[PDB]
Ligand binder design. Structure first.
Ligand SMILES: [Zn+2]
Ligand SMILES: [Zn+2]
Ligand SMILES: [Zn+2]
Ligand SMILES: [Zn+2]
Lengths: 334, 328, 332, 339
């Protein structure tokens, strides 16, 4: 399939040589290759897109990124620097590249203003945030976005009518020490990533974010970070036990997955899991994505192009869902 | 289908009735009925079994159980007390009721001896443990069982050749405060339970427990506590990235699910997820279970009895897999 | 779920006392209740709709119906009689009942004119035809609609922009005797029905009906009459073998199922097969239906309402697909 | 996966090479290659097996084969010729090649005697028959095997305890004229094949063949010739409607699929349909198959080797179900010449 759209696609700031090499060494068997590709915006990245039937990618800042920065002024300065950098870096290829906003999430009003700045000025397509904001004087705390103090931010997101991609981050601080340090091969894609995002997303559900902000679109990578596996079980326990005991969110978990939540295929090129999600989530709410350069184009795209599924859903998941959700202009081979 | 076998089926101690009823306020819409049913062994429990086609259930101590007790002497005494209690309580129904061992997991040698004691004396079918053992100052510490100090325990488990059921427990202490207190509707079946068990089970995988103890059978409830959903993703990251970087476990995740792991249908009466698991896990390693009394018999058994799947797999999952695994 | 739409729902003419008795003797355990329910249009049928959350049903003439009549003038007269009868019988329930055209398919131009007559005069939502038209002396011949001479009829269907539901018919004549008489319990839903419809519908594909008429919408019951089970196998043999050897289809079989074909859940209340069809066909092309009164409302509707599937597709399949495809107005 | 076993794998007689090459013009893009490969037993065939991880194949006579021959004496003589031919042709490779019996099915006792002859003398693994036997004048009649006169045959099959593979055959004669001549692109794999076998197999079910012969094992290719798609629909209509009206078979359709029927993956390299069949049929009754040379080894084996399903079911379907059902030699894989 030509003209696919992918949107969990990372870049790094070239000056961050040590940080990029550190993350590369934890996520890639060839870390110098990883570094070259996460730094490149317009050369190898577009050659891969041309080679593998990808018309358009929406770029986002690497994890942990700004969500690792616990000093609010340093975090804000890095978010601004990243946003200005990537807007300029993609300027030559508006037919191939868009960007998501990078945000410091220490303060709701500040994040709202920066999101508004770069969506309005640069035409960014939404925001991508690496789960909770690392915080505290020494980086031991974390900020979730499901409390009412974030209403001023979520109302900006819905006023702009752009999605928010809730990406994972590595575990840090006392949580890292107590749960993960002694089984550290589970940090990242094997388990820790999905546990963080699913906690936060279901926090958004059960703490009323989607009730207060019913137009809000939240995107989850990796086929939904475990959640569809338990769609039956979560729904049974919410509807039959937790709501009788006081849970007051207005809709069912299935209704939130129909109206507010999306899942992507990033890093999860599983035909069997995708077929399962056709039932539990539905092709209208599933988006192709790669997770480049943590994943390579060939793996994602040979898998997707090879899917022996119906042509309507293959087109929707491959590009047409994203074209409508992100209001995309005509892009290469759209 | 008649003669079904279920094995994530809880009881509590009668002397804890008030405590039991207090805690039931968070997960039972009728806490008085929940306390009555969890304390009952041979009356209502067997009546439900007879009415819903359950020939045999293996009973286990309710969560958090002994894993909530951070004083080692008190924990050990309670495990002993519970094991003797349930052996005596079920003794008149050998054809309908078995038991899993209850253990204090503060000390590997201590836990191995108590497991050996009750398996040999009472014919218990295995052990069931509610995830990590609370310990340390004020019970804020957590004991996982994937470190080398637990080899002496796992060696006793395989010597006895009985399975070990890794059951969830609620988050406690500072972890509870940091992650769950502000989104507490997610505590239990909605999310926290599976996050705990999958962390611990995949710690056993990656820290080599099944390589040092290849006979070991670990049973997971709730269709595998998220793990089968990511069978492809875990496998890809383990084989293609983590092992080249240094991960040293000898088998693939799929190989551990064929040799060492089992999943049950407890609290997960999902034809959709079960079908997905038929491909990713396989009918030979899936066991029916209920999670009574947090779940009721009618929900679990109406679902399973109505499953429109092939005859041979339905019988394997409903009873024959468990008959052979636990040698009933 | 409330407001469901069903559209493989049959009626008979009340004067046909014996032809209803015969058909019921093969496919119904209570011939009395069957006759009473297939004859009813506004009473027990709306009672069932009210008890089971069905907002609207599109009614169609029983099988084999007009396709059993090999005398063209008797066949055309029955299609006219049926079309006037049902349009009258449903007129006081426009928020609950619609109708498909009944057609004699002896002649493309004749059938076209009658379809245009009843769509224009009564607002019928399409046509429903019970597979091939019996023809010739004794009625042993069969008229298929995939030849170029049917272009004027399919051109009418796409001009009116209404769907054509290709319903099964029993096996008759020499074919019945040679293949079905000595294994007659397979006649109908067990096997014969799907073998007829799949032959005809795949005839339309490979003889170019959808290439000449790209806007044409054909609806198949019973989750597609076996075809989705072989979507991979048909696709492989068409693309890799039949097309190098002459098959001139512009599109793949999957593309025709995306653009021209639909399937319904009539008489196939199988969660297993539906889930499989979400992959092979897709929720946008699947329609709830019952096959009343051969099936009862309770079986179809307790199954559908109970489906533990995503909310978007449950709404689309249950009602919203049909609302858009049949340009249904406000109803409940 | 090495050591895979396939068993819908055809050959033709060399003396028919010109007729074979002609007919391949309709179902092979390179009919010269098709004729060369369907006529070869030990060279290219085994080379493909070596290259693609196939340890063992059971060979059978191509369709329509003896079922096309409506003179009973000619058909019997051909079946005998074919059986002696293939037994001799495969005899040096017992760890790579087995054979199914080829039968004339004009007369039950004659067919039973030939099946017994070649199972006993040659160690054939079962029978493979291309649906109904052409009979009568002009060969326009059809002999089905679900009537009571075939009981003597099915008792021989269960006494020998070998399976019977019910393979398709092209439509012929008047049925071909009436239904398929004007939509000839549906003849074969696209539709006609499955319609024939499913009618015949469900005739066996509803006419009580598996009640009179409960040990009988019938194998269906192409993931069951449509039938599992309608497992729910067939079961509902059998149990709730047709049995009250007089259908007298004793078990459900699911019970026959657990006890008497097998399906193979021949010509149906569909992860989607296979997964569906895991639920409706179960991995214990599913067998890998290729349908060579109509299908090529690369298509079947790259698909099967790439399947991301649980290890145990993959081994059962790929070889272990067949190793037990057809009593393959222990250590046969030591001869697999794997690359
Ligand atoms: Zn990522
Ligand atoms: Zn439990
Ligand atoms: Zn009907
Ligand atoms: Zn074949």
């Amino acid at each position: 399939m030509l003209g696919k759209v992918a949107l969990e696609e990372a870049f790094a700031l070239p000056r961050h040589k040590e940080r990029t090499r550190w993350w590369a060494g934890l996520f890639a068997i060839d870390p110098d290759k990883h570094a070259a590709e996460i730094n490149d915006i317009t050369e190898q990245r577009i050659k891969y897109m041309n080679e593998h039937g990808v018309g358009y990618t929406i770029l986002s800042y690497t994890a942990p990124g700004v969500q690792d920065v616990w000093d609010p002024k340093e975090a804000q300065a890095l978010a601004v620097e990243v946003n200005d950098y990537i807007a300029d870096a993609i300027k030559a290829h508006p037919d191939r590249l868009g960007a998501f906003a990078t945000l410091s999430m220490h303060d709701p009003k500040e994040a709202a203003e920066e999101l508004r700045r770069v969506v309005t000025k640069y035409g960014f397509k939404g925001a991508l945030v690496n789960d909770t904001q690392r915080a505290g004087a020494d980086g031991d705390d974390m900020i979730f976005y499901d409390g009412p103090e974030w209403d001023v931010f979520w109302s900006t997101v819905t006023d702009l009518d752009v999605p928010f991609y809730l990406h994972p981050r590595n575990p840090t601080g006392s949580i890292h020490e107590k749960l993960w340090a002694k089984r550290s091969w589970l940090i990242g894609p094997p388990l820790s990533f999905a546990q963080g995002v699913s906690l936060h997303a279901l926090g958004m559900v059960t703490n009323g974010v989607f009730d207060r902000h019913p137009k809000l679109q939240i995107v989850l990578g990796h086929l939904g970070e475990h959640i569809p596996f338990d769609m039956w079980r979560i729904n049974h326990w919410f509807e039959d036990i937790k709501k009788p005991l006081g849970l007051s969110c207005k809709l069912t978990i299935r209704e939130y997955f129909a109206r507010n939540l999306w899942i992507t295929t990033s890093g999860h090129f599983s035909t069997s899991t995708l077929q399962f999600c056709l039932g539990e989530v539905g092709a209208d709410r599933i988006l192709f994505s790669i997770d480049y350069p943590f994943e390579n184009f060939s793996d994602a795209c040979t898998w997707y192009d090879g899917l022996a599924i119906n042509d309507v859903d293959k087109r929707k998941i491959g590009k047409d869902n994203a074209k409508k959700l992100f209001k995309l202009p005509q892009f290469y081979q759209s």
